[PDB]
Design a protein around this ligand. Structure first.
Ligand SMILES: O=C(O)c1ccnc(C(=O)O)c1
Ligand code: NI
Ligand SMILES: [Zn+2]
Lengths: 329, 8
């Protein structure tokens, strides 16, 4: 289907767009998952919200100052928690002189300016906010209610895993960054950019993910020694010059306001915001996910980490393999 | 446990 593993962009009509679950199966039937990442531009009619007129009042409980250290294309990003602030106050910060998007002539220029300036001013990211900007009104592709088999997890123990099982908001500013990672438990994710400046993405095909991991162990041997899933700490940045230097296949794509991105199981991704914006995201699953969840690595060195028991998925949805699966086989 | 932007 997609033997070169290009990132595909889809432009569904309303009728095609209607049923989220069915649309995921469709894009996979066209090979979208091979890239690890896909863009879906929803039909022009569809709006998740009538107006964003009052957002300035929204509280960001725990903005993070993103402090990037390193050199020659290899960095570590520490996120220091700051005091709560409103989106209004955040927006004004984003557009102040210290923080504002650099003058640039096009994307290649901006991207150069991102990688060149990463360690200087630490941007503030209004990340990981529990909430949704969708109107209650909205039936299709509603990040707060996608209805996939991921919903089984909460059914089973009453555990909500914020951001995984519930929607997160991210108010971004220039240079705010998501490090290289795959999702918790190698889940899919869906990401909608509500408004504002773009969010750029780098993605490595799932079939080359292990190559990335071997690369990263070669870059940070102390870290790999400390934890057998250290990329899951989500602090490793690696430039596209470096990926090219070590022959890691990747592509890049820029998501603009009003567009969805979907990441697929074991699709490594990373990227950065161009300027003030607002995105919404959560995780989801399909049957095809289960085998990834079964073998997903887990961080062995922190206690704060997302773990989902796969027992219910195999028992109910892979019943013929459940008995063997219980005994290591 | 919750999802997070990590970095500590
Ligand atoms: O900050 C984001 O936009 C973003 C994008 C993709 N993934 C993550 C993540 O934390 O999984 C965060
Ligand atoms: Ni992600
Ligand atoms: Zn760890």
């Amino acid at each position: 289907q997609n033997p070169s593993c290009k990132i595909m962009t889809f432009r569904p009509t309303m009728e095609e767009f209607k049923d989220f679950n069915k649309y995921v199966a469709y894009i996979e039937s066209q090979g979208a998952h091979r890239a690890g990442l896909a863009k879906i531009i929803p039909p022009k009619e569809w709006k998740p919200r009538q107006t964003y007129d009052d957002i300035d009042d929204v509280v960001i409980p725990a903005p993070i100052q993103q402090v990037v250290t390193g050199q020659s294309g290899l960095f570590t990003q520490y996120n220091i928690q700051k005091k709560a602030m409103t989106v209004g106050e955040y927006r004004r910060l984003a557009n102040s002189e210290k923080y504002c998007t650099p003058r640039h002539q096009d994307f290649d220029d901006l991207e150069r300016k991102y990688w060149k300036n990463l360690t200087f001013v630490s941007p503030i990211y209004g990340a990981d906010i529990s909430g949704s900007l969708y109107d209650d009104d909205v039936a299709q592709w509603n990040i707060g209610s996608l209805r996939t088999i991921l919903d089984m997890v909460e059914r089973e123990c009453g555990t909500i895993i914020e951001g995984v099982n519930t929607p997160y908001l991210y108010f971004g500013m220039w240079k705010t960054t998501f490090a290289w990672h795959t999702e918790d438990m190698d889940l899919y994710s869906i990401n909608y950019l509500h408004f504002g400046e773009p969010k750029s993405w780098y993605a490595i095909p799932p079939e080359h993910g292990k190559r990335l991991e071997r690369l990263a162990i070669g870059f940070f041997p102390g870290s790999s020694q400390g934890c057998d899933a250290f990329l899951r700490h989500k602090m490793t940045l690696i430039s596209p010059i470096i990926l090219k230097k070590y022959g890691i296949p990747f592509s890049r794509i820029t998501q603009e306001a009003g567009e969805f991105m979907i990441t697929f199981p074991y699709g490594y991704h990373a990227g950065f915001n161009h300027g003030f914006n607002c995105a919404e995201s959560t995780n989801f699953a399909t049957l095809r996910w289960i085998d990834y969840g079964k073998v997903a690595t887990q961080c062995t060195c922190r206690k704060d980490m997302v773990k989902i028991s796969m027992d219910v998925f195999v028992r109910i949805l892979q019943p013929e393999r459940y008995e063997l699966w219980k005994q290591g086989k | 446990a919750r999802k997070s932007t990590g970095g500590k």
